[PDB]
Amino acid sequence: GSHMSELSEIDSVAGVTIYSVDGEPKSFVYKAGFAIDADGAPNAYAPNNGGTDFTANGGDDQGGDWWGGPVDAEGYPIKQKIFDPFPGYYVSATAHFNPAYSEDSPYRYIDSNSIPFIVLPGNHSNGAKLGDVALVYNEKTGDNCYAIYGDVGPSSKIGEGSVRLAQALKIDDNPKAGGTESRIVVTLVFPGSVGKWETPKRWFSHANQLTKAWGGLSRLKTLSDQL
């Protein structure tokens, strides 16, 4: 156990209070549910409901409003090539991206299947920039994982992250029926910590260094009981 933390409200979304954690390093925290964001997974979306998510959860794939990823000049989703992970599936995008790759490439986006990432609500980043790191904890399983701020969600919803983060937290990772509405996940974000794409080894190390400086899981576990 650790001492309790001193908390100062900075925001509120969907009945979830977001608190700055007084002290250094600078951080904010919230306790929320955990919806599955399959964005960036190269098998999330395909024609005829072929992906791990239903196609329509990315929008209309017949030239209408498609938000799941990039589109061609006639508005249809880009299909992956023979050198992409899932040829013929659609390219699924995340807000955070790797500039080494082109807009039409799955490799530009953060693969939800492999990378632990959190989503923050649009207009509710609270000073965090895409690529910043976080420590995430599930109070019902005792599991934790470092993660990046990797995607942007609806402004009216909070508590969401990647397939791999769900696995690490022992939350059902299925895009179609997984996640949880129970407010069991505590997310500690370090705004200003990275703010760019870098290798997972590098950002994970930086998350580890910030977490050690901040007081570790022991402090976050105690903090969770305050939320």
Residue numbers in the entry: -2 to 224
Task: Give the article text.
We focus on AMGs that potentially encode chitosanase enzymes that metabolize chitin – a common carbon polymer. One expressed protein showing endo-chitosanase activity (V-Csn) is crystalized and structurally characterized at ultra-high resolution, thus representing the structure of a soil viral AMG product. The structure consisted of two non-contiguous structural domains. Our rigorous analyses not only resulted in a crystal structure of a soil viral AMG product, but also enabled us to propose the mode of action of this previously uncharacterized chitosanase enzyme in the GH75 family of glycosyl hydrolases.
The V-Csn structure was solved in two crystal forms; apo1 containing a single molecule in the asymmetric unit, and apo2 containing a dimer in the asymmetric unit. The apo1 structure was solved by single anomalous diffraction (SAD) methods using the signal from bromide ions soaked into crystals of the apo1 form. Refinement was completed with phenix.refine24 against a high resolution apo1 data set extending to 0.89 Å resolution. The final model comprised 1811 protein atoms in a single chain, 398 water molecules, three glycerol and a sulfate anion. The final Rwork and Rfree were 0.1198 and 0.1307 for 174,427 total reflections. A single V-Csn molecule was located in the apo1 asymmetric unit. The N-terminal part of Domain-1 (residues 1-36) is folded first and the polypeptide then folds the entire Domain-2 (residues 37-108) before crossing back to complete Domain-1 (residues 109-224). Inspection of the apo1 structure shows that the two residues identified as putative active site residues (D148 and E157) are located in a cleft between the two structural domains. Two additional acidic residues (D34 and D36) are also located in this cleft adjacent to D148, and these residues were also conserved in the other GH75 chitosanases. In V-Csn, the side chain of D148 makes hydrogen bonding interactions with the main chain amide nitrogen of A92 and the side chains of both D34 and D36.
